[PDB]
Design a protein around this ligand. Structure first.
Ligand SMILES: Nc1ncnc2c1ncn2[C@@H]1O[C@H](COP(=O)(O)OP(=O)(O)O)[C@@H](O)[C@H]1O
Ligand SMILES: [Co+2]
Length: 300
């Protein structure tokens, strides 16, 4: 809520994305034109939803939030489309999860702003974990595709220091750095960790968040020096123990973990791959030497 950027000026990091989006936004506003469709792609907690709202606010139009799975029958999509006002933003999270029914109606609406038997010109903003998850057709409809990658430790530290300030708590630089290094490159994680560290500060009655307080918090939260949580470790341990380090297929791995292949590949794998703990091969996923050493498993 109060911790969510209200404009690009408040949006830390993602310089490439900001410059690209800013170019298009400022131009459209200056011409009083409807912004071209925008695709926001990247792992969760990186700011896709945040950017969608910023786009609407900058254009000074209304944003209509919806989810791919939430829309089943064309009736749901129609009601939403016909409620759009000129320049409004239609934000669809998990846009790649749109069934053939609603998707066909959407592709149609953005071809000439009209349906089966007239829609006000609008800007479609989709959010997806992976741009490839989108069908070839609908995918070619976005004039602006923004690929968000994990944030740097420095950017995360800045976001953490900002969140602490908004929560009325002081924090030392080294402490903010420590949280950033454990935030798995994600703003969402960094902010939630900061709230939990704030709770520790409260209970120990300290004047400001320091490294000691952060370490105490990480121990309680079971977050290791690499920012890995319980589930991250379970993924690596399962590959190591049950599958001898891999390669193991995504479906097989998800079945053993008792989770959907999607949550695995879309939510947890991205950072594990980025940080060099996991690798993908044609035969399946495998763990790296870094994984064994980090989890203290003898390298076979
Ligand atoms: N660049 C950023 N600067 C500051 N906070 C950010 C940034 N990106 C994301 N956040 C924060 O992290 C949380 C997660 O963002 P959100 O936009 O909901 O992620 P996504 O839709 O990609 O899953 C939000 O609370 C938000 O206010
Ligand atoms: Co497979």
């Amino acid at each position: 809520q109060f911790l969510r950027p209200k404009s690009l000026d408040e949006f830390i990091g993602q310089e490439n994305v900001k410059k690209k989006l800013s170019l298009a936004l400022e131009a459209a506003k200056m011409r009083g034109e409807v912004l071209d469709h925008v695709l926001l792609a990247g792992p969760p907690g990186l700011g896709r939803t945040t950017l969608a709202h910023i786009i609407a606010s900058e254009l000074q139009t209304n944003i209509h939030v919806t989810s791919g799975p939430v829309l089943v029958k064309q009736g749901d999509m129609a009601a939403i489309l016909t409620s759009l006002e000129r320049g409004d933003v239609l934000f669809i999270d998990e846009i790649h999860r749109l069934n053939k029914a609603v998707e066909e109606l959407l592709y149609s609406a953005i071809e000439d702003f009209q349906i089966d038997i007239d829609i006000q010109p609008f800007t479609l903003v989709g959010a997806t974990t992976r741009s490839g998850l989108l069908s070839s057709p609908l995918r070619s409809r976005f004039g602006i595709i923004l690929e968000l990658d994990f944030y740097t430790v420095k950017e995360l530290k800045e976001i953490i220091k900002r969140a602490a300030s908004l929560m009325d708590v002081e924090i030392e630089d080294a402490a903010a750095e420590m949280i950033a290094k454990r935030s798995r490159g994600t703003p969402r994680i960094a902010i939630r960790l900061t709230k939990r560290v704030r709770d520790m500060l409260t209970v120990v009655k300290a004047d400001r968040i320091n490294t000691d307080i952060v370490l105490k918090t990480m121990e309680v939260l079971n977050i290791d020096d690499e920012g890995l949580d319980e589930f991250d470790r379970k993924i690596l341990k399962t590959i190591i123990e049950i599958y001898r380090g891999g390669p193991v297929g995504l479906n097989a791995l998800a079945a053993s973990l008792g989770v959907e292949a999607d949550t695995l590949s879309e939510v947890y794998e991205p950072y594990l791959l980025q940080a060099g703990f996991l690798a993908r091969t044609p035969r399946g996923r495998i763990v790296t030497e870094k994984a064994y050493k980090h989890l203290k498993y003898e390298v076979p």
